[PDB]
Amino acid sequence: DILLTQSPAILSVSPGERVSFSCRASQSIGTDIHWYQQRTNGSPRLLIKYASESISGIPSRFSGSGSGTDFTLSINSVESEDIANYYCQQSNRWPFTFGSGTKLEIKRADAAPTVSIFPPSSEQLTSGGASVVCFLNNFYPKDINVKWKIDGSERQNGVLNSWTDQDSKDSTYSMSSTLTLTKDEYERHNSYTCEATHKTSTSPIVKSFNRN
Amino acid sequence: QVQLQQPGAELVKPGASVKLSCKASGYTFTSDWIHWVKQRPGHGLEWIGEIIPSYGRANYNEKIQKKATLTADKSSSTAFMQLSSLTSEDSAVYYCARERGDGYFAVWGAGTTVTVSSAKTTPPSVYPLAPGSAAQTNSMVTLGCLVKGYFPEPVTVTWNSGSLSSGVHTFPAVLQSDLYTLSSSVTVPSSSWPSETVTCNVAHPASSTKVDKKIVPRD
């Protein structure tokens, strides 16, 4: 069975620079290699077939090369939409096999997170629940810290965090922090506060609201 | 049009079986090969096996445990993969892809999310996320909607019935006590809302549900 090695597994690159993905087969497979792109939460998409043949609809940006055991998928001047996983797949011998895949990262300029805080809806309060939601959107790099405060006093319980992958829209990152309480617990406090700490600013970006 | 149609999700109890379907449209030939690909969360693509509907012949990956038995209905033009005796190791996204017999997969299905658990199906609760009257905006404004307490994965979130895609982020779900939770964010010109309406649509295929929520200012 053909082993397809994709190294390195992660590629980071400045916007507008040329990148090259490598794929080495355990044995000669001629030009029977194919490249597929898979973005987050999406199905694979054919970019190059038979090592170097271009697919209609695919940007001329993408090109392919190589033969025998070594193959290369090149992207000339990378842009934000190229952020995805890249797989190679041989069809020279049964069974067909896939590569391990390579993630593409983009080193863009630093961006401060846009912070937004949202009070619990009345619809949610109806069911006896109350969630305060904070969005830290479109920042770079992805390293960031969020802190909750209730009536001036830091809160960590009832907090669930979720981080997005690098956005294929603008090469940025985003994060959601949800503070869930019961309605009863929520109704006996006044001020709710979300604080975002990122390298783009010495001061924390703070968004707050009073329940009243 | 979309060539290959797969169910969005399938909930299977541990040890039980499930038959995944792939309905094909577009050009159909006797040389069409239906391939099935497995993908576990955060991992790569794994070839399961292939079937040719005209003969009923199936070939399987010998490197893995044979969980699949492949069949096909010619009268309904539908390909079927029978997964039996499933464990938690079998929870994954299963794509179906069409090969024109030339080695590469020209088109893929949407994929069927298979979750192996003993927990019960639960439809999501969708709540609006509109900012307070004390917050300040620039040239842009951010709204959202919260999807809480659903099972199993996945859910599909769109904005204004799909017409609003740019400025949209959907966060990964978090799991707590057999229930998932996520939120979706949208950003539109601050001058356009609420003068123009903004609505998020949440679809949970496992419960066959789809709901809309319009975002208005907190009065």
Rounded to a whole number of angstroms, the distance from the CA of A90 to the nearest CA of chain B is: 8
Structural domains in chain A, CATH included, are 1-108 (2.60.40.10), 109-211 (2.60.40.10)
Question: What's the token pair of residue A23?
Answer: 């794929």
* B217 prior amide bond cis, ω within 30: no
Put the strands of the sheet holding A173-182 in their side by side order.
A114-118, A129-139, A173-182, A159-163
Close Cβ partners of B96 (under 8 Å, ≥ 6 residues apart):
B4, B6, B20, B22, B34, B35, B36, B37, B79, B81, B108, B109, B111
Resolution (angstroms) stands at: 3.4
Nearest to B90 by CA among B64, B108, B111, B51: B64
Question: What's the token pair of residue A134?
Answer: 């904070």
Close Cβ partners of B159 (under 8 Å, ≥ 6 residues apart):
B165, B168, B184, B186, B198, B199, B200, B201
Question: Which amino acid would we find at residue A53?
Answer: E
Within 10 angstroms of residue A101's Cβ, the number of other Cβ atoms is: 20
Cβ <8 Å between A121 and B127: yes
For residue B71, the cross-strand partners are: B80
Within 10 angstroms of residue B25's Cβ, the number of other Cβ atoms is: 11
* Residues of chain A with C-beta less than 8 angstroms from the C-beta of B93: none
Within 10 angstroms of residue A154's Cβ, the number of other Cβ atoms is: 10
Whether the CB of A120 is below 8 Å from some CB of chain B: the reply is yes
Close Cβ partners of A146 (under 8 Å, ≥ 6 residues apart):
A134, A136, A161, A175, A177, A194, A195, A196, A197
Nearest to A17 by CA among A108, A141, A142, A140: A108
Whether the CB of A3 is below 8 Å from some CB of chain B: the reply is no
Question: What's the token pair of residue B86?
Answer: 């499933």
Cβ <8 Å between B183 and A34: no
Within 10 angstroms of residue B40's Cβ, the number of other Cβ atoms is: 13
For CATH 2.60.40.10, list the domain ranges present in chain B: 1-118, 119-217
The DSSP result for B81-96, as a single string, is EEE-S--GGG-EEEEE
Rounded to a whole number of angstroms, the distance from the CA of B73 to the nearest CA of chain A is: 24
Burial B102-137 (b: 16+ CB within 10 A, else e): ebbbebbbbbbbbbbeeeeebbbbbbbbbbbeeeee
CATH number of B119-217: 2.60.40.10
Cβ <8 Å between A133 and B146: yes
Burial B159-171 (b: 16+ CB within 10 A, else e): bbeeebeebbbbb
Which of B103, B142, B176 is nearest residue A135 as measured by Cβ atoms?
Answer: B142
Which DSSP category does B156 fall into?
Answer: E
Close Cβ partners of A157 (under 8 Å, ≥ 6 residues apart):
none
Whether the CB of A209 is below 8 Å from some CB of chain B: the reply is yes
Rounded to a whole number of angstroms, the distance from the CA of A14 to the nearest CA of chain B is: 22
Which of A43, A127, A162 is nearest residue B108 as measured by Cβ atoms?
Answer: A43
Cβ <8 Å between B127 and A123: yes
Question: What's the token pair of residue A137?
Answer: 């959107």
B1-118: what fold?
Immunoglobulin-like (2.60.40)
Pairing mode of beta strands A85-90, A33-38: antiparallel
Give the count of Cβ contacts less than 8 A between chain A and B.
Answer: 134
Cβ <8 Å between B59 and A1: no
Question: What's the token pair of residue B193?
Answer: 């809302």
Round to whole Å and give the CA distance between A59 and A74.
12
